[PDB]
Amino acid sequence: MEQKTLQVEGMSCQHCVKAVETSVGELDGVSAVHVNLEAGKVDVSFDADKVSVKDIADAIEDQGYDVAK
Amino acid sequence: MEQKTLQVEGMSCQHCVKAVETSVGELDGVSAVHVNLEAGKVDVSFDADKVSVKDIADAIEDQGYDVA
Numbered sequence: 001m002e003q004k005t006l007q008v009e010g011m012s013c014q015h016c017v018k019a020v021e022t023s024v025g026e027l028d029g030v031s032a033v034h035v036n037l038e039a040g041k042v043d044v045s046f047d048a049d050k051v052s053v054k055d056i057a058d059a060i061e062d063q064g065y066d067v068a069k
Numbered sequence: 070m071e072q073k074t075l076q077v078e079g080m081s082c083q084h085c086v087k088a089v090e091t092s093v094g095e096l097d098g099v100s101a102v103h104v105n106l107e108a109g110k111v112d113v114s115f116d117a118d119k120v121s122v123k124d125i126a127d128a129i130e131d132q133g134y135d136v137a
């Protein structure tokens with residue numbers, strides 16, 4: 001298993017958090033996703049054989065948020 | 070038809086806008102609802118015999134926003 005924290009800009013409220021958690025948690029291989037809204041950190045745990053960091057970042061950017069470099 | 074504008078604090082994005090639009094619009098007696106995020110204002114047209122200003126304000130507060 002891998003555990004990664006992504007730095008995300010543009011989330012402003014708990015609806016934004018729920019959009020990210022729903023979109024990331026629907027990727028095959030993710031086991032958990034939680035967000036620290038104040039810090040703009042998205043914590044994810046996943047099976048890297050089934051899903052990549054980039055897949056997760058692309059899901060977040062598809063929801064309109066920017067993922068730091 | 071009756072109308073009311075409410076000043077609403079706490080909305081921060083288009084998800085908030087939609088939450089307000091949905092919860093107010095779902096109230097029996099509401100004819101139309103417009104949210105201005107930038108101005109923090111909500112305009113509602115409604116049948117005051119079926120829904121009240123307080124019902125509208127309460128629906129907005131139940132979504133987590135303050136009503137002035």
Ligand SMILES: [Ca+2]
Nearest residue numbers: 117118119120
């Ligand atoms: Ca009545």
Ligand SMILES: [Cu+]
Nearest residue numbers: 012013016082
């Ligand atoms: Cu939001």
Ligand SMILES: [Cu+]
Nearest residue numbers: 015016082084
């Ligand atoms: Cu949002």
Ligand SMILES: [Cu+]
Nearest residue numbers: 013081082085
């Ligand atoms: Cu929002």
Ligand SMILES: [Cu+]
Nearest residue numbers: 013015084085
């Ligand atoms: Cu929101």
